[PDB]
Amino acid sequence: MWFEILPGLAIMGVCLVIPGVSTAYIHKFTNGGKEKRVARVQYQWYLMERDRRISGVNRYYVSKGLE
Amino acid sequence: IVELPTLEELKVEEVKVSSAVLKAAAHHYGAQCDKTNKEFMLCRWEEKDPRRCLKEGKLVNGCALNFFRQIKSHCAEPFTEYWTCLDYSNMQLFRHCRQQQAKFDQCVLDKLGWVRPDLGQLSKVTKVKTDRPLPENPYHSR
Amino acid sequence: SAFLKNAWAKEPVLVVSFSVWGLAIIMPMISPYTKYASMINKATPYNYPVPVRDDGNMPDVPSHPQDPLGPSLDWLKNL
Amino acid sequence: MNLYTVIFINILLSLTLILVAFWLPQMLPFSMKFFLVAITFLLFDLEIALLLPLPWAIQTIKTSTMMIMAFILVTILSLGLAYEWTQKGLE
Amino acid sequence: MFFINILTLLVPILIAMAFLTLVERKILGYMQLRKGPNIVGPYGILQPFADAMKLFMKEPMRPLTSMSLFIIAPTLSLTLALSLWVPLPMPHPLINLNLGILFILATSSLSVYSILWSGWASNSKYSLFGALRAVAQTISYEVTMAIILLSVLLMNGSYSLQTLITTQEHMWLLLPAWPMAMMWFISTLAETNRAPFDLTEGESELVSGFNVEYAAGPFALFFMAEYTNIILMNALTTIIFLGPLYYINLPELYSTNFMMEALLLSSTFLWIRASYPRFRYDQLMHLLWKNFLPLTLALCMWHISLPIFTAGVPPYM
Amino acid sequence: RMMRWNQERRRLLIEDLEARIALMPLFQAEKDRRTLQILRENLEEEAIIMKDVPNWKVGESVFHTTRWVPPLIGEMYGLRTKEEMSNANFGFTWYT
Ligand SMILES: CCCCCCCCCCCCCCCCCC(=O)OC[C@H](COP(=O)(O)OCCN)OC(=O)CCCCCCCCCCCCCCCCC
């Protein structure tokens, strides 16, 4: 019947979720489990950069009250 | 020449904590330590040069470090939980973390006695009477 | 009026088109909120509020902005 | 740079495909009416360009002014369009 | 990593792009009382790969045509389509172009060059007419397409597609602004030269002006482009107007929901094609310079006043 | 709903803008302190680069006024590592 148009769709869907799940986990892996900071405006880039300088070289590492 | 100040003149303890840490305590720091900062601002504005307010800047930093030492000593755990959750978010938005914020805010009210400043009441202009001489002829007007 | 009627039934886009043109030219003029826009946007604190020299006779916010004196946005709150 | 990296891969992927295509298989109009529409386009495009800044103007302390100014922009151009119709230019 | 994130977001879309043609040649089929392609492979799954290989193997005829432009137009087409998928705001978008919607609008406009140049390069009368007709309709639908977005943005506060995920945390922008959704949907149908608006390659009226002379590999690249676009524009409808649910803790839900809505609206233009005859050229443009453009202009005003008189100006973050 | 949501969203926006309003004083000091260091550090190398050059005032305001003219980006990072300069110059246009 119409049962059969589903096979094809399944392979479309599966190929349209990969991208959204992929981009959203290759970010939380590269950024240390914390969402990649979105620096829309400079202030944010400043804060981000400030973070880099604060520790290691990468901003994702985040020092706390114990420092 | 340029009369650039010397390093020893500009070496002072550093806050160095992740920006996230600050944003979480931002409100309280805007509260417990705006006396010196406002004065420093006054100097840095009327007196355009930075060299003319360096010492004030040192005072600016000193005020915050202890601000942190107090929190480290008391209600450190709450603050630790609040910043970690705040840091995970990409724009470190305040509303994703309100449950952690409440426990951090309530505790320091309970122990430190400080208070989270209500919506606003930080943006409003402040009057600080810097005993420094209100400068004149700035920009070596000639 | 009669044409208006047919216009409502023939070429019923322009009618709607104009109607909106007007309704957008009226609501702003009559609105318990129109005033807020210029305030709500005015208030947003984009730029730093440089302090003022406490020379004397100052009714301004007394130092710590937590002090009572000063402007308030409780209007924004509970809006 | 990140964008540059993505885009050059994008062109590369295409150029690769066209090449494969060629290398693998070895084995007078009178659009006067249109012309007019085209010009209006140019004009309307420009208006739109003057309407693009709104997203930041909505923030203007001078909200009222922005309203009046903006409203005028759309209205005036709307009139231009209507004229086209009134003069039956487009038709 | 970032490279891996380029394979994903590309291949996955290309593989999905292939499966759309199949779900087009079966959904159109069942609507017309026929099974559609099921004999090659299981249930026709290998069918898209099969003609791709035939198309590339068949000779790329070079008519006795400006070669450079003739060959470039296909390249531009695919380049643009794949590029427009870079800033889409599925969770944690590949690239947070701050002015993304503008970027989308920009690249979308550049595509017109391909059809125009293709027709001019082809040097065939049919192709020439196709280009002229195409450029006109394309650009015109761009004029309402852009204004419809400007109305949206003013209620979103920014050009960044990422903001709408925070704008649509309580209600879809269809409820408000539905009148434009429809007008965005019809414009999305025109800009992908799909059926109701497919005078670019009417085939019956004029015979595929865009690719009259294009065959094999060039045919395929635009071809691929069109279908990827078919998805992209539908996906933009599924972010701008139908806002999928989103949870910072679980970012996947968005993608999954984004999937479902994109597939259904992609299914809709497939369903539109079989269901409607094709608009005439004059009729098409009238609808936009006459039936819609006045509607789109007026609501723009309403959406300018709305925030102010409702003191609903959006945050600029 | 849109009216109420954006009014709420506006409240959140004023809250975090004020959060930096409070924190910028700490940063302003930090920036200046570091800025001067870069200028001075460049002075050291400056006092070691053109020493041999005749008629070479180690350094002198390109201008006549003694007013404090802020340091261009180039001046701060010009002598420094190329990457350092590039970062500052093309480091925002290129997102995180
Ligand atoms: C008060 C505050 C401000 C708000 C005011 C709101 C007032 C109420 C809303 C009024 C406008 C509602 C409709 C908006 C879109 C339609 C605009 C329009 O006028 O239609 C033009 C045209 C029909 O015109 P025609 O029949 O030729 O006659 C013209 C007579 N003047 O339309 C067409 O011919 C379209 C042809 C389409 C062919 C394909 C159809 C596909 C149908 C299925 C998909 C429909 C869209 C799905 C969208 C999903 C979500 C994106």
Side-chain angles (χ1 to χ4, degrees):
Chain A
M1 293 300 293
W2 53 261
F3 298 170
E4 304 177 350
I5 78 185
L6 304 191
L9 288 157
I11 323 185
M12 279 192 58
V14 165
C15 292
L16 293 181
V17 63
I18 293 171
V21 176
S22 69
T23 299
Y25 275 122
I26 311 177
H27 280 179
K28 300 186 187 63
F29 177 100
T30 58
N31 309 311
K34 291 187 300 301
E35 310 178 8
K36 181 168 64 183
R37 281 202 188 91
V38 185
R40 187 188 194 283
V41 296
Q42 309 250 8
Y43 178 70
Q44 301 174 347
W45 179 249
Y46 177 66
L47 263 55
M48 179 176 316
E49 290 291 49
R50 174 176 173 273
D51 297 353
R52 146 163 69 91
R53 302 179 190 87
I54 281 176
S55 301
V57 182
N58 312 351
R59 49 92 182 182
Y60 62 83
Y61 301 105
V62 283
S63 297
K64 55 188 176 306
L66 295 174
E67 192 165 303
Chain B
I1 306 301
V2 296
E3 293 177 350
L4 283 173
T6 181
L7 292 78
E8 185 62 13
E9 170 180 355
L10 47 77
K11 187 193 65 59
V12 79
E13 185 179 338
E14 292 83 350
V15 175
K16 301 155 48 184
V17 82
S18 178
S19 69
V21 177
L22 312 181
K23 288 186 50 180
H27 290 292
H28 288 253
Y29 164 81
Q32 296 281 135
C33 183
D34 61 356
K35 195 46 187 176
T36 172
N37 300 356
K38 284 296 181 180
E39 312 166 15
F40 170 81
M41 297 296 180
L42 204 160
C43 179
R44 196 54 172 81
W45 261 270
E46 183 65 13
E47 307 180 356
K48 295 180 182 297
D49 306 14
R51 291 193 297 274
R52 301 174 183 177
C53 310
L54 295 191
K55 308 176 183 179
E56 288 289 347
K58 292 189 292 185
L59 323 177
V60 173
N61 298 28
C63 183
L65 299 162
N66 192 31
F67 172 80
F68 278 130
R69 293 182 183 174
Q70 313 183 43
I71 317 184
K72 177 183 308 183
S73 61
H74 328 292
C75 305
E77 182 50 59
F79 190 38
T80 300
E81 294 163 273
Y82 181 33
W83 78 255
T84 310
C85 82
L86 177 63
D87 209 9
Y88 169 66
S89 178
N90 63 34
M91 283 179 59
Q92 293 177 335
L93 295 174
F94 290 74
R95 65 182 181 88
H96 297 165
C97 291
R98 283 294 147 98
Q99 157 65 50
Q100 295 85 0
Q101 178 179 141
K103 297 183 71 68
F104 159 64
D105 277 358
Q106 193 50 65
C107 289
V108 294
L109 170 67
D110 293 340
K111 299 183 71 68
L112 295 174
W114 314 345
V115 185
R116 165 71 169 268
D118 188 20
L119 177 63
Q121 294 177 335
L122 275 66
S123 171
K124 63 180 68 180
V125 63
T126 303
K127 64 179 180 180
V128 295
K129 183 178 179 180
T130 177
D131 289 345
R132 76 179 185 78
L134 177 63
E136 60 187 3
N137 289 337
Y139 41 91
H140 305 109
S141 180
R142 204 190 71 176
Chain C
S1 173
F3 77 100
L4 179 63
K5 300 180 68 283
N6 63 45
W8 169 232
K10 66 162 181 50
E11 282 291 356
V13 198
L14 285 62
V15 174
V16 183
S17 176
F18 304 149
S19 172
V20 172
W21 177 94
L23 177 63
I25 217 69
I26 170 182
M27 297 301 301
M29 307 178 308
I30 61 100
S31 168
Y33 288 103
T34 301
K35 66 173 182 302
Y36 295 114
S38 181
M39 306 180 183
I40 183 180
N41 71 359
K42 183 191 306 179
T44 299
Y46 302 105
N47 57 351
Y48 173 82
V50 172
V52 291
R53 185 170 289 270
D54 192 350
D55 54 353
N57 308 348
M58 303 277 293
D60 306 3
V61 189
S63 307
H64 198 159
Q66 281 185 359
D67 293 26
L69 306 185
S72 65
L73 302 186
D74 300 351
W75 69 271
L76 168 82
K77 317 183 55 187
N78 57 83
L79 184 55
Chain D
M1 189 61 184
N2 258 352
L3 177 63
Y4 272 119
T5 294
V6 162
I7 306 297
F8 295 161
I9 299 309
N10 303 347
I11 309 176
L12 289 184
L13 208 42
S14 301
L15 276 173
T16 288
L17 283 195
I18 283 298
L19 178 57
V20 172
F22 283 66
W23 175 91
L24 176 156
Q26 286 185 359
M27 69 193 88
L28 182 51
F30 182 62
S31 297
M32 175 45 213
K33 176 187 178 181
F34 295 160
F35 168 76
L36 185 50
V37 170
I39 299 306
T40 73
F41 162 71
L42 287 168
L43 311 181
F44 282 88
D45 186 17
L46 300 175
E47 176 195 15
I48 298 175
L50 309 176
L51 284 170
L52 290 184
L54 298 174
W56 303 276
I58 305 304
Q59 261 81 11
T60 56
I61 297 182
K62 285 189 294 298
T63 56
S64 296
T65 298
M66 153 272 296
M67 154 201 173
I68 307 307
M69 171 58 56
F71 287 14
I72 293 305
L73 182 45
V74 194
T75 296
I76 56 185
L77 268 300
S78 306
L79 305 175
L81 182 65
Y83 170 77
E84 185 79 354
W85 303 22
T86 67
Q87 220 74 348
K88 191 196 173 306
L90 74 176
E91 315 180 11
Chain E
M1 290 298 185
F2 179 74
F3 303 99
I4 293 75
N5 199 5
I6 300 183
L7 276 313
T8 66
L9 185 271
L10 284 194
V11 177
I13 303 301
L14 278 194
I15 286 321
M17 177 178 73
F19 280 101
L20 188 147
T21 59
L22 177 63
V23 175
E24 168 156 25
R25 295 176 64 186
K26 297 183 71 68
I27 271 176
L28 295 174
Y30 281 97
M31 293 177 182
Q32 295 138 5
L33 275 66
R34 65 182 181 88
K35 298 183 71 68
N38 64 34
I39 186 167
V40 62
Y43 303 115
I45 60 171
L46 295 174
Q47 183 65 260
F49 306 112
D51 65 9
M53 292 177 72
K54 76 162 289 184
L55 275 173
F56 296 161
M57 291 177 182
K58 291 189 292 185
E59 184 178 2
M61 170 52 180
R62 310 181 303 267
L64 60 175
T65 185
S66 182
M67 182 68 177
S68 183
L69 287 80
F70 194 86
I71 61 89
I72 290 175
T75 72
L76 177 63
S77 314
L78 190 60
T79 301
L80 301 184
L82 304 178
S83 300
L84 279 166
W85 276 86
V86 178
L88 203 63
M90 303 163 296
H92 278 68
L94 185 62
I95 296 191
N96 56 355
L97 301 183
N98 303 2
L99 296 183
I101 294 169
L102 286 173
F103 166 94
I104 304 300
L105 288 175
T107 303
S108 301
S109 306
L110 301 176
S111 65
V112 69
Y113 287 124
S114 68
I115 61 171
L116 163 69
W117 301 349
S118 66
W120 173 90
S122 299
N123 301 173
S124 67
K125 192 174 308 301
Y126 277 79
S127 294
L128 175 61
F129 196 30
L132 307 167
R133 301 209 301 180
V135 55
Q137 73 148 1
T138 298
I139 65 178
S140 302
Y141 276 78
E142 183 65 13
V143 182
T144 188
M145 184 176 282
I147 294 169
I148 278 155
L149 261 188
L150 177 63
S151 296
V152 174
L153 303 143
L154 292 169
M155 76 185 60
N156 166 43
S158 168
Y159 275 99
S160 179
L161 282 70
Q162 189 178 4
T163 58
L164 289 83
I165 297 166
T166 60
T167 301
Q168 272 150 311
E169 183 178 2
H170 297 165
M171 67 174 282
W172 289 358
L173 269 204
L174 177 63
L175 310 184
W178 65 255
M180 293 177 182
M182 297 187 184
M183 277 196 305
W184 172 254
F185 181 75
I186 303 301
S187 295
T188 64
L189 276 169
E191 196 98 1
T192 55
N193 287 339
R194 295 286 293 172
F197 316 92
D198 194 1
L199 45 73
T200 48
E201 295 185 324
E203 200 70 328
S204 55
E205 307 166 19
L206 188 147
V207 187
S208 297
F210 184 36
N211 302 353
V212 175
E213 277 67 27
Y214 285 83
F219 177 76
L221 275 66
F222 292 136
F223 200 84
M224 293 165 49
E226 181 183 6
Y227 284 71
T228 299
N229 273 352
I230 301 169
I231 310 181
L232 177 63
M233 303 294 188
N234 275 301
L236 278 148
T237 300
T238 301
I239 304 301
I240 300 159
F241 287 102
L242 276 66
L245 283 179
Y246 175 83
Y247 295 86
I248 166 179
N249 36 11
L250 297 79
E252 178 184 7
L253 172 54
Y254 194 81
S255 60
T256 299
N257 187 346
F258 167 82
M259 180 198 57
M260 294 204 269
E261 292 177 350
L263 273 204
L264 295 174
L265 274 66
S266 280
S267 295
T268 315
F269 296 160
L270 276 66
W271 180 7
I272 296 326
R273 184 206 206 189
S275 297
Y276 296 144
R278 292 194 314 270
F279 261 113
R280 297 178 52 179
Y281 184 57
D282 55 342
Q283 294 177 335
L284 189 147
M285 290 196 53
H286 165 286
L287 176 153
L288 188 147
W289 283 92
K290 195 106 56 181
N291 280 171
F292 274 9
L293 177 63
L295 178 63
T296 309
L297 294 169
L299 296 174
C300 180
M301 294 191 56
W302 173 250
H303 277 126
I304 297 176
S305 161
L306 199 164
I308 305 299
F309 81 82
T310 63
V313 298
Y316 185 72
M317 302 179 180
Chain F
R1 167 145 309 181
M2 186 89 262
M3 177 178 73
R4 300 285 304 274
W5 177 221
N6 288 337
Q7 273 149 12
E8 165 56 29
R9 295 176 64 186
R10 296 286 293 172
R11 293 178 179 83
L12 303 160
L13 176 93
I14 294 169
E15 167 208 274
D16 65 9
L17 295 174
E18 293 177 350
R20 63 180 295 275
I21 306 301
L23 289 159
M24 183 175 171
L26 180 84
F27 300 145
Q28 175 64 197
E30 296 171 5
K31 176 175 54 181
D32 285 6
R33 183 179 300 98
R34 184 181 57 87
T35 301
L36 296 174
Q37 197 166 0
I38 306 184
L39 279 298
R40 183 75 157 178
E41 291 196 24
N42 298 338
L43 194 280
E44 157 196 355
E45 334 306 347
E46 184 173 10
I48 317 172
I49 294 169
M50 301 187 59
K51 54 186 309 175
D52 194 351
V53 174
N55 188 2
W56 171 244
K57 267 53 186 177
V58 170
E60 174 57 22
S61 63
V62 293
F63 325 93
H64 311 125
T65 64
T66 43
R67 168 175 52 261
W68 161 234
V69 180
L72 290 188
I73 291 186
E75 317 169 0
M76 289 184 300
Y77 304 92
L79 309 178
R80 303 186 162 272
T81 300
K82 173 178 180 180
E83 161 270 359
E84 288 186 13
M85 200 214 61
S86 177
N87 175 12
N89 197 8
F90 307 97
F92 189 68
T93 300
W94 302 342
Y95 72 110
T96 299

